[model samples]
Target: HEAQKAIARNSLLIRSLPEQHVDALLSQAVWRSYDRGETLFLQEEKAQAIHVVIDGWVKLFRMTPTGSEAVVSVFTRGESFGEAVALRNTPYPVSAEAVTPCEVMHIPSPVFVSLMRRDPEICISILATTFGHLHSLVAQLEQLKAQTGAQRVAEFLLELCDCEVTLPYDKMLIAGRLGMKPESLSRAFSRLKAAGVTVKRNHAEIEDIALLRDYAES
Candidate 1:
């Protein structure tokens, strides 16, 4: 009962779903749990289901041929992922792993297709959300290609701060997402600190956005 209430309260995808839809969806969905650092899926793996994060956090990352891992994104509680590939009938482009102990709900592709066909409104909402994420990713890529490392670090810090009081992932994971080596990330942080930018326990307080903007535009 408590678990159901928690899911209904926090899961944007599930909570927004109608009660009539809930029972059938719940019937087809399976809840799974994973411990910290567990791999849920691997890159290029056959995508089978849409994953809804019920608790804790997960990282989506890519592994290079040389065996280095690059984080693509992180999903926290109440978020959904794995739907794009699952719905499109393609393999997962990135691997997913548990950053902390996680409880996830899996909706098989057939069930997802059935639901979407039955609930066109929900399908449209999902598409809108996906498009928003795509736009954000494009903006981030533009920044990465146009800005300095210091500016990139500042923007990254600002974005992370928007999510949590402290950074959600480790420096290494964030560095990978930012497309920089861990050592280079460390140097950027060091430079930021030397310039009187405050960082405490991976939480940063920006003294001036204009200063960072100058670095970005330079």
Candidate 2:
């Protein structure tokens, strides 16, 4: 039997597929585990498989010539990526690394390529997924233009929890994801203390949601 659990990890791809199509795809899927800092794939590496996370976190990022990296996205359970790249059999635009212990399913492109011919629904799902990513990028851009450093950090942190939250990744990664530098993130955190949100290492406790959103939305 395939990883029924992984197949059940619902996302755009899984949700769109009918029972038979899901079975057909999962029949060939491979499930793998990664340690905290293990790599799933490298930048410009030929994409062999489309992925869906079953547990834990994976980050897609690009490294600069000077070795500085930008966090493109972080994907966790029920989310998928590499579909467009894998469908084209092209190189990945960014590198993917496991930010924590992870379980993921890699459905090879060949199976999906062949499966797409069976129904037009899968093709539509792929387009929707790509467009969703595009919209997500636009949303991030809006955040950068519309909010201050502390407000951005506050808004980002408030989404994770009302009372308590753990920063999903390191501050450096969080900084990059929020379109900021590490030092800027430190200052942003300092600013949040006034809003009754104290950040210590990767943990933060918002005294309440009102305080966070009050400072964030202003």
Candidate 3:
């Protein structure tokens, strides 16, 4: 029942399925847990299944030739991943790691493929979801190009909470997600203090969210 609920929440494709089809998909789902800092899978590994995050956070990244990691995306509860590669029957282009203790469900690729063959309408749902992901990536790129480092940090903090925000992960990883260097991120945090933001370790207190939002948009 939990699996079915998670599938319903995370996947338009699954939610659009007939009741029996939804049951069939859930029947093949394998639930698992991962500790913080645990690697889920590596880049270039053969894609076996699509994953749904039942709870907690996972980061998708790619390693460069110099062994530096580029954080591609992050997924949290009610999100699904690996569908594109799994559908293509290709290796994963990026790796996934748990940023916090996580619970996830793996729906086997063959099961998904079979379902798609049985109901072609599911492909439309998948395409819509994929487009949503693409649009988010485009927005991130726009932010990186159009916004200042401080504005980017302000926007990120605003997203975390209304008035008070705590950093969810290390500043380094946050910097990567925001498309900034660690030093730049630190400077951005320092700059925000002038706009009524106070940073204490991982905790950030925003005195006026409206002002902060205005500053970010400006």
Candidate 4:
């Protein structure tokens, strides 16, 4: 019942549906678990379902021809992904991998689409949610273009935690996500010491969050 409540609260697509409809949808949902570093799906795979992270973290990324990874996004619990591909009946544009041991729920595309066909409001809700994701991507691009490596790292830390934060995955992945070299990210961390940030291995403590925020926005 708590899981169903979580689904209703966190999943925009299902939140608008009637309780009976939600139950029907859940009946068809496939629950899956992944180990750390496991690939959930590959780029260009058929997008058969939309997914919600029930626990832990997942990374969406694209690989360059040279085999380097470009981190697209990182999602944690309560986040949903793959709706656009599922609705359009297209292939996944990027690969998804478990950044940590995780659990996810996959709802088949056809089942969702059938519900949308019966309720035009569901379609509107989907559009709004997709646009929200697009806006997030645009903001990230702006940050990459305009912010210095130190500023970016500061912003990331502030957004990621309240007072103290542990890095959930590899530092290399964080560097990739922030559009900086690993060495540059290390340098950025060093620089943040002046702003009251203390970085230990895989964890950081902020002495003054307000000062850190000022540092990030500077």
Candidate 5:
């Protein structure tokens, strides 16, 4: 199938396999279509296959104890998910839902088993991708922990100046980089005024570098 072929060549793990081995695995693989907002897998669900997106987007997320949803990541065409969970034969760490109608290929456990028996590259490639995910998630964890909106904006400002700094980009992009919304960034900037930060358009003047540095730490 065209969808299966697209996933085979696009997925990093599958794409990393030997040319002939790629064909071998796909011979026994399965592919499916999902409607918009459809759930692909739930957290703690059995993950028996790795999924590769051929079209549209999938949102990886978790349900928090406070009855809210926290997004982990988003996957698009040519990206894959669930490599580590499926390999471990364990429950999914996060849920995946289709953000839009999508075509996905599922490389079943048997495909991995056969390739693993013949070549170790399958496991190695999976590990490489899995490590990338761990590093990113941990970085995000650090960014969120005990870091208030004002503190985050303060730290960002620290990089630009010992005293005075103009914003390198527009607020929209800066807010994204600092992990705050546009409105939250506005609030953060206003909060910084108490520490002697005055913004007149793109330029900001600081009253005390010492006070601004103190605000960033707390």
Candidate 6:
């Protein structure tokens, strides 16, 4: 029952539905708990269902040609992911690992499709959300092309902060997400520290968000 409420609160599709409708969806949905550092799915695995985050964090990443994981994004509480593979009608693009112990609600694709057809309004909302994610990915690619590694790393931290002066996610994963080698990320942060910025081991306490923004812009 609590899991149902958690699912309802976290899933946009379920949260937007009428209470009666949500009850119906919950009937078919199943809760899966993943331990920290456990793999939820593998790259190129068949995309079976869409997942809604009920609790904790999941890291979506893919292996590079060199067989190193590259962090693509972080899915936190109340967020949804795995929709991209569903929408694209393809295999999973990235493997998902639990950054923290997490509970997720899995909705079978057929059931999801039927629900979408039955609820035109929810379908529209889903499309809008998907489009927003696509746009964000495009923007990230542009940043990779245009910004320096340090700037990209700074922008990533700022974006993940939800505009606050805080650091989120493990630094190693952050390094991967910014497409920087672990050693290089360390050196870059060292340079930033020498320039008067305060960056701790995995956490950074930014004094000025604008300066971080400026760094990203440079």
Compare the candidates by TM-score and give the number of the best one: 4
CA lDDT for candidate 5: 0.75
What's the TM-score of each model vs. the native? 0.56, 0.68, 0.67, 0.69, 0.56, 0.57
Q: Which candidate number has the best lDDT?
A: 4
What digit string (tens of lDDT, one per residue) describes model 2 on residues 1-218?
A: 34545534466567655555677677678989999899999999888889988767789999888998877898766678887788788888999998878888888888888777676787777667667777988998788656789999998877555277655556677776777988988899889899998876656878888877999877
Candidate 4 residue pairs in clash (backbone atoms < 3 Å): none
Query: Lowest summed-lDDT stretch of 10 residues in model 2?
Result: 1-10
Once superposed on the true structure, which residue ranges of model 6 sit more than 4 Å away at CA? 12-20, 117-169, 173-218
Residue 108 shift from truth in candidate 3, angstroms: 3.8
Query: Residue 39's C-alpha lDDT in candidate 2?
Result: 96
RMSD of 5: 11.2
Error of 3 at 2 (Å): 8.1
Deviating ranges (above 4 Å) for candidate 4: 1-31, 61-72, 128-145
Q: Worst ten-residue run, lDDT, model 6?
A: 160-169
lDDT of 5 by residue, 32-103 (tens): 899887998899988878988876667788889997887777665677777767767888889988766788
lDDT for model 4 comes to: 0.79
Q: For candidate 4, which ten residues in a row score worst on lDDT? A: 4-13
- Which residue pairs show backbone clashes in model 2? none
Q: Which ten residues in a row have the lowest lDDT in candidate 5?
A: 161-170
| Model 1 segments more than 4 A misplaced | 8-12, 15-20, 118-169, 174-218
Which RMSD values do the candidates have, in order? 6.2, 4.7, 4.8, 4.6, 11.2, 5.9
lDDT of 1 by residue, 16-125 (tens): 55556666676777778999899888888888887887776789988888999877888765667776688797989999998877888887888877778887997887
lDDT of each: 0.71, 0.78, 0.78, 0.79, 0.75, 0.70
Per-structure clash totals for the candidates: 0, 0, 0, 0, 0, 0
lDDT of 3 by residue, 84-123 (tens): 7998999999999998788888888989887788878876
TM-score-better candidate, 2 vs 4: 4
